[PDB]
Symmetry: C2
Subunit: 445 residues, 2 copies
């Protein structure tokens, strides 16, 4: 396999190793078993720094891979599929708790920031951004989903393990920050305190209108300055992220009620979730002449819509994966047909495969994430099989998941070492195995 040598692996989990052995024995396709082995543990192998803080509480720093900082998004997804093993592995469990606690610490340092350093560093590369940068931050691109992924992870950890110890005063500070930030970004009474520009040739790495972005009408939705691709939004009410905020606020509300016994703060979360949900139903649905009612990718509240999808989760395609809409919501099913078609400007189809990319890497570059999400949200084995086959056929022989690959030639690719994507691939294969679809995977020749 392509895992690091054992002495070079950063974090070892007995339960992860045992699960790798179990899947290896069930899978008859050698390439698939190998890819699983490379990818499922890649986070633990290459990105995880577990320790105890000054207070004796667990603390885990998680790098993205070939970008050396911790994203709230990537870290929340990178350890996600390990939660289901935590009850059998105390060391794994405490590492997970450490991730969540480190995420809350990040939110409290700056709830607008997407990417964090492990303490202060000097001469950070993005210190020159025209925004309120600090040495503790790697980057300060405001992305709604940065605040959702930790809530998601914390809720699943708590439900799985029963361990409420993570919901301490730093949690209360973090959810209080999440509420403040989301409300600022509804922009009801003014543009808010967040502004961003950067001197760059990359148009989506800076923000129009002196760092405020295109105007929005403050109908109750939350502005996301940037997408989970880290690209600026076009119309600033980013729809899949708003849907993720609704779910995440409701999870926070349940924690605050049942664990913290803070019913006022719980209600603040539920009320905001409801406001956003009501506004999404009113403003985010577009009567498409070909596909019927679909969800727009972005809106501005004035009546504009942006009909497309980007591979990064939260995306329109992946909403049932995160649990933000039902997979059988008829509007979602119409949307799924739309995003996976040449009516979507960021859908590409070529000699080697097809799928969704976006403006991050640009034309003709398909993201394995989109194909994985197509599989995650599929209700048909034949569709799932085409997805897994394509993921296997587009790795350029590396045994790993990439950011993107060229539609006509998977040897042209980006990000060799992208731990979130490796985690997702392991998660997908493990899901299929656990759902009784081993025979389906073994039919891949």
């Amino acid at each position: 396999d392509n895992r690091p040598e054992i002495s070079n692996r950063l974090f070892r989990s007995n339960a992860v190793e045992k699960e790798i052995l179990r899947v290896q024995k069930l899978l008859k396709n050698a390439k698939l078993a190998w890819m699983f082995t490379n990818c499922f543990p890649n986070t633990l192998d290459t990105t995880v720094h577990f320790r105890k803080g000054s207070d004796g509480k667990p603390d885990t720093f998680v790098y993205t891979g070939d970008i050396h900082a911790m994203w709230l998004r990537d870290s929340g997804a990178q350890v996600w599929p390990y939660v289901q093993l935590a009850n059998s592995d105390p060391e794994l469990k405490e590492m997970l708790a450490g991730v969540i606690l480190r995420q809350f610490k990040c939110i409290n340092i700056d709830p607008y920031a997407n990417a964090f350093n492990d303490g202060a560093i000097p001469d950070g590369h993005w210190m020159s951004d025209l925004t309120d940068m600090k040495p503790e931050l790697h980057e300060r691109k405001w992305e709604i989903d940065s605040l959702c992924y930790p809530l998601r992870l914390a809720y699943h950890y708590w439900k799985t393990t029963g361990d409420a110890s993570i919901f301490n005063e730093e949690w209360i500070q973090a959810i209080t920050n999440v509420l403040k930030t989301f409300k600022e970004q509804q922009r009801k009474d003014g543009v808010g305190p967040y502004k961003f520009q950067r001197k760059t040739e990359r148009a989506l790495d800076t923000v129009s209108n002196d760092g405020l972005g295109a105007p929005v009408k403050p109908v109750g939705l939350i502005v996301s300055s940037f997408r989970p691709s880290d690209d600026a939004t076009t119309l600033q009410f980013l729809v899949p992220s708003n849907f993720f905020a609704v779910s995440s606020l409701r999870k926070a509300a349940e924690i605050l009620e049942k664990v913290n016994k803070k019913t006022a703060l719980s209600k603040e979360c539920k009320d905001l979730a409801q406001e956003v949900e009501t506004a999404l139903k009113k403003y985010a649905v577009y009567n498409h002449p070909k596909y019927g009612k679909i969800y727009a990718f972005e809106v501005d509240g004035f009546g504009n819509h942006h009909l497309m999808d980007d591979a990064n989760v939260p995306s329109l395609l992946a909403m049932p994966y995160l649990g933000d809409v039902n997979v059988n919501d008829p509007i979602y099913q119409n949307t799924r047909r739309f995003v996976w078609s040449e009516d979507n400007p960021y859908f590409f189809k070529g000699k080697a495969g097809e799928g969704i990319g976006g403006p991050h890497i640009g034309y003709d570059m398909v993201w394995p994430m989109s194909i994985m999400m197509k599989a995650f949200t599929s209700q048909n084995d034949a569709e799932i099989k085409t997805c897994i086959k394509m993921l296997m056929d587009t790795d350029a022989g590396t045994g790993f998941m990439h950011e993107s690959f060229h539609k006509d030639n998977p040897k042209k690719f980006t990000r060799a070492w992208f731990a979130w994507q490796n985690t997702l691939f392991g998660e997908l294969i493990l899901k299929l195995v656990n759902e009784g679809k081993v025979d389906l995977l073994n039919s891949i020749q």
Copy 2:
């Protein structure tokens, strides 16, 4: 008045001076007569460098004013209102021929460029832009309207004066270049030869997707990478510019047939104009739930629309002014209600005035150009009066037209010296006088 001292004025026209005295003696409102005197001749006073070329032919270089280079657009507009005087003033007429011939020379240097130097400036400010630069260019932002404005000026010059001497072999080369460039930018067979990025904090001064912009589907419309604001397009089929291309190609078709006797090249212009017109009819009309059928500001050919307007002409509001749609086109009339409303993200209304701006200067900055265009396309004297009074009341006492002013405070403004806008003001007042509406202007206290 605020004109330069006589000995500092760059170009003198007898006919212009006579019209100023005419208007001064007719107008009872002293501030309006003073504004006309400041504004109407501003281009001649401050931006026109007329000479005889080595070859005998007139040549006129026209600076924008407080930005020091020649735009195809600005130069085309700056001298526009003088054409009506050309039959009375040989020196003015020759100067106007020289603008046109200089414009054709510019187009032949680079038909993608918006802005030109008077000769070569190898260390020019923008020579570092990530595009194919030449020292003769000030800036190389691809704007469809750059190629339209010279065609419009030449046609009006020819129709007014009868002088076809401007339609020489440099003209043939220029129109050939226009056709070639427009067709490249339909992107039927690939993305074309034009790409642009710039390292800048200003998001709309560089272009997404590695300098290609957001994908379009090649339905027959022409891509404009930038708008007449010099801001990058969002969806790249810029609708008012496409409508302007239709009219301009049809003017070029007439000239080529009647003057040059080139029936094939004439037909190529007619056929392209028709292709674009048919595509506009099929793709640029949006069924707005409030306003009815309207014209989108931009489309991508996939089914996306961008519902807004920007002050800069060509704009949706200004289409009847340029002659690209009839003022009583019902879809235009719906569009006009839409663009001058708070449903347009770039319409602003405050304590001092109201009107359309754009992302160039950003939030709450109204451009006098929009108010002027509302008056140019008005069919009601009361509306015209309100616009003239607003122009007078929002000059911050300078006696000149600005780029933009704050909706609550005209003393906060941009571009003190903007010759295009000054010319346009003088054009507007002279139009109203020549239409017999001086009593309307005299009713302003």
